[PDB]
Design a protein around this nucleic acid. Structure first.
Ligand SMILES: [Cl-]
Ligand SMILES: [Cl-]
Ligand SMILES: [Cl-]
Ligand SMILES: [Cl-]
Ligand SMILES: [Cl-]
Ligand SMILES: [Mg+2]
Ligand SMILES: [Mg+2]
Ligand SMILES: [Mg+2]
Ligand SMILES: [Mg+2]
Ligand SMILES: [Mg+2]
Ligand SMILES: [Mg+2]
Ligand SMILES: [Mg+2]
Ligand SMILES: [Mg+2]
Ligand SMILES: [Mg+2]
Ligand SMILES: [Mg+2]
Ligand SMILES: [Mg+2]
Ligand SMILES: [Mg+2]
Ligand SMILES: [Mg+2]
Ligand SMILES: [Mg+2]
Ligand SMILES: [Mg+2]
Ligand SMILES: [Mg+2]
Ligand SMILES: [Mg+2]
Ligand SMILES: [Mg+2]
Ligand SMILES: [Mg+2]
Ligand SMILES: [Mg+2]
Ligand SMILES: [Mg+2]
Ligand SMILES: [Mg+2]
Ligand SMILES: [Mg+2]
Ligand SMILES: [Mg+2]
Ligand SMILES: [Mg+2]
Ligand SMILES: [Mg+2]
Ligand SMILES: [Mg+2]
Ligand SMILES: [Mg+2]
Ligand SMILES: [Mg+2]
Ligand SMILES: [Mg+2]
Ligand SMILES: [Mg+2]
Ligand SMILES: [Mg+2]
Ligand SMILES: [Mg+2]
Ligand SMILES: [Mg+2]
Ligand SMILES: [Mg+2]
Ligand SMILES: [Mg+2]
Ligand SMILES: [Mg+2]
Ligand SMILES: [Mg+2]
Ligand SMILES: [Mg+2]
Ligand SMILES: [Mg+2]
Ligand SMILES: [Mg+2]
Ligand SMILES: [Zn+2]
Lengths: 119, 149, 84, 124, 50
RNA sequence: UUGACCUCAAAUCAGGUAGGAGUACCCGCUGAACUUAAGCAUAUCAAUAAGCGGAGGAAAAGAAACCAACCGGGAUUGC
RNA sequence: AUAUUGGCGAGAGACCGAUAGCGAACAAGUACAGUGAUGGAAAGAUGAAAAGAACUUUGAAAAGAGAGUGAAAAAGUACGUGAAAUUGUUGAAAGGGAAGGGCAUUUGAUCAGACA
RNA sequence: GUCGAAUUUGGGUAUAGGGGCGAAAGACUAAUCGAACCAUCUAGUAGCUGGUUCCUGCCGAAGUUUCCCUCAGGAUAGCAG
RNA sequence: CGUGGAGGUCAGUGACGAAGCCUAGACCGUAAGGUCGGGUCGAACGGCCUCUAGUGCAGAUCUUGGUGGUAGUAGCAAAUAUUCAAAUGAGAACUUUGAAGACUGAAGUGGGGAAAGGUUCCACGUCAACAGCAGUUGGACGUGGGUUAGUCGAUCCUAAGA
RNA sequence: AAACUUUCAACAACGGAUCUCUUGGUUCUCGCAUCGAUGAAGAACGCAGCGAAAUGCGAUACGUAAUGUGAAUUGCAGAAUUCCGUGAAUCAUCGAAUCUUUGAACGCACAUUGCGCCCCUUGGUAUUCCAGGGGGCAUGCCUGUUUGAGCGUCAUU
């Protein structure tokens, strides 16, 4: 058994919140029954369903915030790209390709040429 | 530790020499790497000859002054006598050395002749981008060998 | 009386558990660990102690984050998600 | 002979890869050849073994016996046949582990994925 | 002693739970070479040394 | 009174940045003795071990206040 | 173009073969020792497959004697092969304060070679 | 022996290795003290002691000369292959 | 002469039994050694021409491991001391109950704690190992149960000092 | 003459040599350049139907989401509809998340699971007391903003 992530993505936050509470109630009563029975493997599928519901709720809330900060130059650090510490401090593509006006004139005037030794 | 009629030896092994022993096990491997690097550079760069034209100079010292060899680059006066500028010469595959001077007319004439022959045996493609395909000669030094006068 | 009779008076700990490395090496009165050097900012280590470095170096633990760096580098630090 | 630098002939490496292969890769390793009737009918030589496949034993002391695959024991590199078992002294019966390379498939269990695999291998 | 810090008591709790024999059903697993718990402890033989 | 300038402070002010780890190889500082001299102090071991500071995929060096005395050579690195 | 006993990914050897090779082929920087800095092991192999011995009998029981499984229990979870020191049983021989050895032959036991 | 004091003692705290502490014995400083313990330099050097693994065949010594802080060691000549 | 590994060769040997091991059985060599039969055993191994070395042990108060004589020997003698019966059990000098004789004699062999130990506390089940005899008993083995604070401490204060 | 002692053989002991085996070690060569305040390396404590360790993981706890493969997992139990399919799996891949207490470790402390302050919100007849939930408060330095200090100093009243 267990819930399906793609099915949970088609409902509002209110429905997800209510379904989370019901799963928690079902988990609580199964723990009571575990004390009297030699085994109860059904408790596993309930725990995974709670994890799946929490995952879908988090991805909906995080997606909403990305729309709020869309286009702005400052965004929360958890919504920024991870990469590495050294990669985030490196010069951007625009900064690394900057040249002075003096050097730009030289590059246009005398670029590397294409030639061959035939005749 | 001195006995018998033997030469005096001067083997310098009183330091921790075993920590600094370099055995060239990769001699064959490095040759493969160098050949791969030359092959990939020739394909990558251009149909260009993979090396720059060099002038002929006189070796210094009384022991070696009887022979001529390849120098670093053509002088500013040599390239000027050939009808081109130093900046343009570098982009066509001519090495230019600004710190070498000309005092020998024979050497100056020989280097001018080399520049003349080089310009007549190359094709400079236009900057438009047509670039007709041409056969790539991998060695400009082999095309223009240096001969003892 | 310096042997067996003296051994009966040992009931006061000189070291307790260290909060940084977990060993029973935190000197009570000196307020410093004899193994990792806590609370000093750097971790205590010495080149003459080759074995000591091996016991605590990188790779002896879980490597919770450093495990996945090689995989992320191999894919070029991708962003987004896989396409269906 | 070997002609690629990406493949190794080291015996030690080959044995470690076999014994530590994950479950998905053991499926390919547990392949069985088809019968003459099925080889002509489909046009392929061998396929990975699948549950609910009819097989015939062609090697060992159980040669000549048939049955259906009831379990593919990937962890043990073996399969089990429903009616090929051994009777213990106490009266209980245990399955006999067989290697798929010593079997011959006489009937294939077919679904959407199996049919696509057959056509992918050039079969009909 | 009766007076003990929380850290010591938490440390003692884990050592109690780790002091148990291996379950029998584990020895029946495929490719199992473990027979007895080699890290068993008795309070009078080996001291924790905390 | 008012308004500048200079210098110097404060703020949970706006946005950033440094620490620790690893350290085979790399750039510096600091720095022994056993040992050899058939003793031993200069010397040697050695501008080494240990100790301390700082980087990268390489580092460092690098387009001559160079080498030369030749009919002169021509950034640096390595064999 | 040079360096690289670290990290990641590969290909190899006239290298070692469980007292060897890294300390570690195994729940090894583990068990354990030290107040502490530190110190630091031992330990791989039933069989193709547990088919890991139902059942009967003796004993309080462990187990034994049968039966059975297996190509083989001279493979029984003290498990491949199973050497020596050392030990039990059986058989033969000698022995008045050591034993063992060399040359020669008697006695006992045991044995190859040609029957041309 | 001493037993109301220069008394006995728990815990807290201070002093760390050519340093500490000492009503002073070179005593004590975790069974370690006329200079603790741990790792490294380090496989430190030794003219000195011990050991140095198969067979057969042929040849076969020296303890003497000169020099040496040389006298349990070397160089040198001799004897040997 | 022998040992580990390498090139070549003998279209060499082998599950109809390779290697190893045991064998007062046989044969060859002055010797280092080589060959064969029998037993045990189960998967690889040898002759010859050459190459190579981490290549041959009785010793080093040698290293690691294993095992002897000594030897059923030294010994299991401080702290006054045990005895009868019943119950249980395969089994009782040592367990339980009852009876008797004794000791600690309030600076105790009594009743609580600090430090230190860490589940040794309690019940049930159980005896291969451990309790230098024994064991049905146990601080042993197996499975469970158990530590309840506005007032008791920590927490707060300051001491030498850090 | 026995016992006893010694030597040899067979069978049985003790012990683990020898032979064969090898998912390990060692050395050489080739390619690549990627840790951390966006909280690293390391440490502590927890998480499975039945688990002590190892391995994996973090109260979403031997895992969640996504993608691929296309029917297992396996010691037992269980679940079965998951089987011509948005779908089995201790599978592979991995770009989205979770990530307890810590640690350069950052409100102050730490041999204490000790003690404060600020903002929003909820309950207790409450801006002040008590409690629950969420979000914050380290240091050096750089650029900028704002609020200031000094007869250091200018001009004007
Ligand atoms: Cl307690
Ligand atoms: Cl390893
Ligand atoms: Cl120690
Ligand atoms: Cl100190
Ligand atoms: Cl011989
Ligand atoms: Mg002392
Ligand atoms: Mg103290
Ligand atoms: Mg250091
Ligand atoms: Mg116990
Ligand atoms: Mg004790
Ligand atoms: Mg701010
Ligand atoms: Mg340097
Ligand atoms: Mg000297
Ligand atoms: Mg000397
Ligand atoms: Mg001296
Ligand atoms: Mg150094
Ligand atoms: Mg880097
Ligand atoms: Mg480079
Ligand atoms: Mg640079
Ligand atoms: Mg210049
Ligand atoms: Mg130069
Ligand atoms: Mg080893
Ligand atoms: Mg056999
Ligand atoms: Mg055996
Ligand atoms: Mg024997
Ligand atoms: Mg004196
Ligand atoms: Mg001592
Ligand atoms: Mg030596
Ligand atoms: Mg002679
Ligand atoms: Mg002598
Ligand atoms: Mg044989
Ligand atoms: Mg014999
Ligand atoms: Mg076999
Ligand atoms: Mg040797
Ligand atoms: Mg010998
Ligand atoms: Mg020996
Ligand atoms: Mg000898
Ligand atoms: Mg000895
Ligand atoms: Mg006696
Ligand atoms: Mg006595
Ligand atoms: Mg007594
Ligand atoms: Mg009395
Ligand atoms: Mg009395
Ligand atoms: Mg009790
Ligand atoms: Mg006893
Ligand atoms: Mg007993
Ligand atoms: Zn520490």
């Amino acid at each position: 058994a267990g819930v399906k992530a793609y099915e949970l993505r088609t409902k509002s936050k209110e429905q997800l919140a209510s379904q989370l509470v019901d799963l928690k109630k079902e988990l609580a009563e199964l723990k009571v029954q575990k004390l009297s029975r030699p085994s109860l493997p059904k408790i596993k599928t309930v725990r995974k369903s709670i994890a799946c519901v929490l995952t879908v709720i988090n991805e909906q809330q995080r997606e909403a915030v990305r729309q709020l900060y869309k286009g702005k130059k400052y965004q929360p650090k958890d919504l920024r790209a991870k990469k590495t510490r050294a990669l985030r401090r490196a010069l951007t593509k625009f900064e690394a390709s900057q040249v002075t006006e003096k050097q730009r004139k030289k590059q246009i005037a005398f670029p590397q040429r294409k030639y061959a030794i035939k005749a | 530790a001195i006995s018998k009629n033997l030469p005096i030896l001067k083997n310098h092994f009183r330091k921790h020499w075993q920590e600094r022993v370099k055995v060239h096990f990769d001699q064959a491997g490095k040759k493969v790497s160098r050949r791969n690097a030359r092959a990939t550079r020739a394909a990558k760069i251009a149909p260009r000859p993979l090396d720059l034209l060099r002038p002929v100079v006189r070796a210094p010292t009384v022991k070696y002054n009887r022979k001529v060899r390849a120098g670093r680059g053509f002088t500013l006066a040599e390239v000027k006598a050939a009808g081109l500028t130093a900046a343009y010469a570098r982009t066509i595959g001519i090495a230019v050395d600004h710190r070498r001077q000309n005092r020998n007319q024979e050497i100056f004439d020989a280097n001018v002749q080399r520049l003349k022959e080089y310009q007549s045996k190359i094709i400079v493609f236009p900057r438009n981008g047509k670039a007709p395909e041409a056969e790539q000669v991998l060695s400009a030094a082999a095309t223009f060998p240096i001969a003892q006068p | 009386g310096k042997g067996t009779p003296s051994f009966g008076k040992r009931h006061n700990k000189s070291h307790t558990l260290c909060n940084r490395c977990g060993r029973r090496s935190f000197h009570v009165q000196k307020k410093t660990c004899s193994s990792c050097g806590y609370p000093a900012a750097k971790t205590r280590s010495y080149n003459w102690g080759a074995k000591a470095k091996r016991r605590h170096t990188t790779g002896t633990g879980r490597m919770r984050y450093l495990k996945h760096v090689s995989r992320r580098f191999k894919n070029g630090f991708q962003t987004g998600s896989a396409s269906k | 002979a070997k002609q690629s630098l990406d493949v190794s002939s080291d015996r030690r490496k080959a044995r470690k890869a076999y014994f530590t292969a994950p479950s998905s890769q053991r499926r390919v390793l547990l392949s069985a050849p088809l019968s003459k009737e099925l080889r002509a009918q489909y046009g392929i030589k061998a396929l990975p073994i699948r549950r609910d496949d009819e097989v015939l034993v062609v090697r060992g002391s159980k040669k000549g016996q048939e049955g259906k695959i009831s379990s593919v024991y990937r962890l043990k590199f073996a399969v089990q046949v429903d009616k090929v078992t051994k009777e213990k002294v106490n009266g209980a019966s245990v399955p006999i582990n067989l290697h798929p390379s010593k079997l011959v498939i006489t009937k294939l269990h077919l679904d959407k994925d199996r049919k696509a695999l057959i056509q992918r291998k050039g079969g009909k | 002693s009766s007076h003990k810090t929380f850290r010591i008591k938490r440390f003692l709790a884990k050592k109690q739970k780790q002091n148990r024999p291996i379950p029998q059903w584990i020895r029946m697993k495929t490719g199992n070479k473990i027979r007895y718990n080699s890290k068993r402890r008795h309070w009078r033989r080996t001291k924790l040394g905390l």
